[PDB]
Design a protein around this ligand. Structure first.
Ligand code: GTA
Ligand code: ZN
Ligand code: ZN
Lengths: 293, 125
């Protein structure tokens, strides 16, 4: 069956249009685990499947592509997801990664500390976040929108993301943000992608594909998270890493996406259409400067 | 695992020759460093030692390079005169028979300066 060979499941518009109360997420295989192929870190499989799904999206893939990776430490001091990004991305891509505690990584630039200490001076092309705050596990009252590191990520989307750029931001049943869902309405397209390697978690990567800087879809973020949970509650997802059995086409396509500087007023129908097809980025072409503040 | 890694990584901070310290430690039966970043790859690569993308043959495994570098892992100074690590940001191919100790393999061997295959494990010059 084909589902197992896909890298994972993407939230369909069937559930995006529902109108339901936010309910508890109850997964029939909750916390079931799948042994890892060749005993690589679980995050190898998880990032590879995220990358495989993004290979089907209209990502902009320019020369000198600017990628920032938050929450990049894992498995006590290493960064397997960053190495997967290095395997996936063009060889001239620039990877900046960040996490709270010290770790060793194959990124070009590695910054330690709170994500708020990460000062992006320019605009980037792709944001990956695997951040999750441990206090989210202390479930007490109702499940409300969280601030935490999402405030930082929302501001980054509004200020430090190229038009045409994209984002993949980890959320869970309880780790989520109204404001971040609503920002998905400023992209050409959006979804939540759940890997098959971690299908037994309410984890999903909230995907914003091709940033437009203007509202395309009016989203009620609290309602949309209720729809995401309704989708998870409705959708059998069996653990699987079959998508990784054939890696012959894994690398990100070398699209040579152009980078253009344009004033806001010059953005017309043609430009929006190119941005929405993954065929253009608008941002500075200076030298990227991303440091600790 | 973490306690054991912490041990040998601590040990190579008490020495003037971290390479020899590591090799002497594992040669005497000490636990090799674990938690190296093994990649999944189509085992259809060229088989060279160090590569910008994974290049493992059917007889190799590919690791993320920082994770098999003793100096990166131990957070100590790199011996290269340029200061730049030779592995970090790249991928390192390890013969499949040596995956028990990728770091020790790397400290014990040298890419051929002419063909960039591991001398003794690929270099045919
Ligand atoms: C989806 N779900 C949540 N809960 C309950 O609600 C609580 C909060 O739910 P959550 O938002 O954390 O979602 P979930 O439990 O699915 O998250 P999971 O543990 O899989 O973590 C997802 C990712 O977050 C990160 N993460 C988890 N814990 C930490 C941590 N302590 N530190 C850093 N990262 C962490 C890791 O990337 C991890 O892969 C859970 O701790 C559990 O009591 C459930 N209970 C049942 N019985 N069935 C469920 O299906 C269920
Ligand atoms: Zn190093
Ligand atoms: Zn040679």
């Amino acid at each position: 069956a084909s589902a197992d060979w896909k890298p994972g499941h993407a939230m369909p518009s069937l559930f995006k249009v529902q109108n339901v109360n936010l309910e508890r997420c109850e997964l029939a295989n909750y916390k079931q685990s799948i042994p890892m192929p060749r005993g690589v870190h679980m995050n190898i499989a998880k990032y590879m499947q995220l990358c495989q799904y993004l290979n089907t999206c209209t990502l902009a893939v320019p020369a000198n592509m600017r990628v920032i990776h938050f929450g990049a430490g894992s498995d006590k001091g290493i960064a397997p997801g960053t190495s997967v990004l290095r395997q996936w991305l063009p060889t001239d891509a620039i990877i900046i990664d960040n996490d709270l505690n010290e770790f060793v990584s194959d990124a070009d630039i590695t910054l330690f500390g709170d994500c708020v200490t990460v000062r992006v001076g320019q605009q980037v092309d792709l944001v990956i976040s695997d951040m999750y705050d441990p206090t989210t596990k202390n479930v007490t009252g109702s499940n409300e929108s969280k601030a935490l590191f999402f405030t930082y990520l929302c501001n980054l989307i509004n200020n430090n993301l190229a038009l045409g750029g994209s984002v993949a931001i980890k959320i869970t049943e309880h780790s989520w943000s109204v404001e971040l869902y609503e920002l998905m309405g400023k992209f050409a397209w959006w979804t939540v992608f759940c890997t098959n390697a971690n299908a037994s978690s309410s984890e999903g990567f909230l995907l914003g594909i091709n940033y437009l800087g203007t509202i395309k879809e009016n989203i009620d973020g609290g309602a949309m998270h209720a729809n995401y949970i309704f989708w998870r509650n409705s959708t059998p997802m069996n653990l699987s890493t079959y998508s990784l059995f054939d890696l012959s086409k894994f690398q990100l396509k070398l699209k040579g996406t152009p980078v253009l500087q344009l004033k806001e007023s010059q953005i017309n129908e043609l430009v929006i259409s190119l941005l929405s097809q993954g065929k253009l980025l608008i941002r500075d072409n200076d030298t990227l400067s991303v440091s600790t503040d | 695992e973490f306690a054991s890694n912490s041990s040998v990584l601590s040990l190579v901070n008490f020495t003037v020759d971290p390479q020899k310290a590591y090799l002497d430690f594992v040669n005497a039966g000490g636990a090799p460093l674990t938690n190296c970043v093994k990649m999944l790859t189509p085992k259809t690569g060229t088989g060279i030692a160090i590569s910008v993308k994974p290049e493992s043959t059917a007889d190799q495994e590919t690791y993320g390079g920082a994770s098999v570098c003793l100096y990166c892992r131990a957070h100590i100074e790199h011996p290269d005169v340029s200061g730049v690590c030779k592995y970090k940001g790249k991928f390192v191919q390890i013969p499949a028979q040596c995956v028990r100790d990728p770091v020790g393999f790397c400290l014990s061997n040298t890419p051929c300066n002419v063909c960039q295959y591991w001398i003794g494990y690929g270099c045919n010059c």
